[PDB]
Each structure stands twice: as structure tokens, then as C-alpha cells.
């Protein structure tokens, strides 16, 4: 007998996409090869994000892509997101962008192209940037989901700003006892 624990032997991590999409799996075949046969860590990161689930691939808005592609030294670099590029109506002017994405919404496509930009697919990124050179890999906000408002210390604990689960919002819905000192206590 060997003195060892086995509860952590199996690592919980995706080796492939749960999706049965045949176009996504053709891109995984592509980047499985590039990640294996090139020393480029960029390929490994993209291969990993192709396995990732829907909530681990948040959409990247147009306004946020412009901000991150406007930092100094990022001129003529292709912005890359393994996800969806959504349009942002709060933007007034779109610059000339070169972007690679899994999906670009219909209105984001017109605005990027109308500014003189180029929209790639990941099979076109490989031919243009086999090792990922001259790229800017970008991610959407992962905690930008309604669930993360409900996580943390339970709402009924001191200095807990977690959001409760209420069927309705209003004066009659979880506001008397425990939420104001006038009714029992507050914390």
C-alpha cells in the first residue's frame, strides 16, 4: 500500500467543446494542430477557449474593443476574441479595425466594415497569423452576468451586498426584519 489520496487525481477541465457544432470542431481540428506543432502559446490559449462554454465566452461589445485597441502601441494589430462581437449603440465613431471573432452581430458587421475595417474568421486568422503574431487577444467581461450579483456572502450577513432571490421587488418583499434596525435588526 501507498499512502496517497486519490480525490484530486482526475483534473476537471475541458479537452474539447461540449458543442456538437461541426464548424466549431473543424476549427478545433485546425488549432489542435497549430497548438501542437508550433511553439506559440497564443495558439494554446485560443485552442482552450474554443472548448469553453457559453458563459466562459462572454460577448465583447464594440465600445470595449475600441477602448482596448486604442491603447498605445496597438496600431495595425488584429483584435481577436473567441466569442461574439456585439454592437454598442453608445459609440458614435468606429475607427478602422481588423478583428477576428467567432460571431459578429449583423449591426456590428455593418459598422466595422463601413469604417474600413476587416472581419476575419478563425480559419483566416491561421493563414494570416499562424503563430498569432501581431494580435491582440481580447475577452468579454466574465462577471458581467446577472448570476454573479447573487454570489458571495449570504444576503443576511454583515456587510453582505449580495443580491437576494425575490419573486417580486417592492416595499412588501423582504425589507422589514433584518434589513432595517426599526424591525428587529440590521446587519
Amino acid at each position: 500500500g501507498v499512502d496517497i489520496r486519490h480525490n484530486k487525481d482526475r483534473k476537471v477541465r475541458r479537452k474539447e467543446p461540449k458543442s456538437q457544432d461541426i464548424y466549431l470542431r473543424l476549427l478545433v481540428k485546425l488549432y489542435r494542430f497549430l497548438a501542437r506543432r508550433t511553439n506559440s502559446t497564443f495558439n494554446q490559449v485560443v485552442l482552450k477557449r474554443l472548448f469553453m462554454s457559453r458563459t466562459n465566452r462572454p460577448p465583447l461589445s464594440l465600445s470595449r474593443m475600441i477602448r482596448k485597441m486604442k491603447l498605445p502601441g496597438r496600431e495595425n494589430k488584429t483584435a481577436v476574441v473567441v466569442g461574439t462581437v456585439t454592437d454598442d449603440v453608445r459609440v458614435q465613431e468606429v475607427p478602422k479595425l481588423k478583428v477576428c471573432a467567432l460571431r459578429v452581430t449583423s449591426r456590428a458587421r455593418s459598422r466595422i466594415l463601413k469604417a474600413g475595417g476587416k472581419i476575419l474568421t478563425f480559419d483566416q486568422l491561421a493563414l494570416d497569423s499562424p503563430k498569432g503574431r501581431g494580435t491582440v487577444l481580447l475577452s468579454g467581461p466574465r462577471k458581467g452576468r446577472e448570476v454573479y450579483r447573487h454570489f458571495g456572502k449570504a444576503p443576511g450577513t454583515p456587510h453582505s451586498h449580495t443580491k437576494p432571490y425575490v419573486r417580486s421587488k417592492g416595499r412588501k418583499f423582504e425589507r422589514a426584519r433584518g434589513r432595517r434596525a426599526s424591525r428587529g435588526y440590521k446587519n
Partner: protein, 147 residues
């Protein structure tokens, strides 16, 4: 579908996933929200603060149409008109400002979140926030109150 669910995997396993000791009994703890001020108090206090008690005034015969007031922030203001409306106004030299009628778009109050483009505009609305009025005035616009 039933073929993908636990029951098919729990065939032959005596207790069916509920244990040999505690068993699956009918209603231990009570039905529904029983015990909220009692044997279930920690769960309610921990996760539903405010649940018990009363706060604030009653209102009989509430009519939610009377308080109808959709709001729009300034950062979405120019989406209510066409794209050519903004560019034509931006490039024109006479200085004419376009009229944006938020009530026609279905909004009543205008709110101040956001920054406007450097472009005069005339905004019609039932209500304005203080900061919305100043931001509209900072670009050379004018606020118009409708009823």
C-alpha cells in the same frame, strides 16, 4: 426525456439515492414555507433578510398606468432618430439643430447617464433630470417640455 435521468441509473440500488438511515419520508420539516420563525429560522434569516414584518404605507386601488414614466439616458439619445439625421446635422453649416422627440420613441423622462456628441440638438420630453438638462445645454442644445 426519461432515458437520460437518474432513475434509470438508480435501478437495483435499494434506497434510490435517499439513504438507508434517513430514508425518503413524506414531509419532514413541514410543507411549503413552514417553520420560517422556527426550526427553519436560520435559512430565512440567512438568505431572506427583511422577509417578516411590515414597512411603509398601503395604497388601495393602485393603478400602475398613473406612474408610467419610461426613461432614456443621454447616451442612447441619438438612437431615437436616424443615422443620417445626426451626420447631416453634424456637417451642415447653417447651425440648425434636429428635434429629437423622446415621447414619440416611447419615453417620458430624459436622464443624464452618458456623454453627448459635440452637436446641438433640440430635445422634447415631459421630464428632464437636472444633469440631463446641463449636458444637453453643454453641447448647445435646448430642452423642450411637452405634456
Amino acid at each position: 426525456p426519461s432515458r437520460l435521468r437518474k432513475t434509470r441509473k438508480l435501478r437495483g440500488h435499494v434506497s434510490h439515492g435517499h439513504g438507508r438511515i434517513g430514508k425518503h419520508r413524506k414531509h419532514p420539516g413541514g410543507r411549503g414555507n413552514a417553520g420560517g420563525m422556527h426550526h427553519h429560522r436560520i435559512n430565512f434569516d440567512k438568505y431572506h433578510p427583511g422577509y417578516f414584518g411590515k414597512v411603509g404605507m398601503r395604497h388601495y386601488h393602485l393603478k400602475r398606468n398613473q406612474s408610467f414614466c419610461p426613461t432614456v439616458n443621454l447616451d442612447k439619445l441619438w438612437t431615437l432618430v436616424s443615422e443620417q439625421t445626426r451626420v447631416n446635422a453634424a456637417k451642415n453649416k447653417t447651425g440648425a439643430a434636429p428635434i429629437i422627440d423622446v415621447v414619440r420613441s416611447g419615453y417620458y423622462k430624459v436622464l443624464g447617464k452618458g456623454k453627448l456628441p459635440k452637436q446641438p440638438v433640440i430635445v422634447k420630453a415631459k421630464f428632464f433630470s437636472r444633469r440631463a438638462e446641463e449636458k444637453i445645454k453643454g453641447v448647445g442644445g435646448a430642452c423642450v417640455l411637452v405634456a
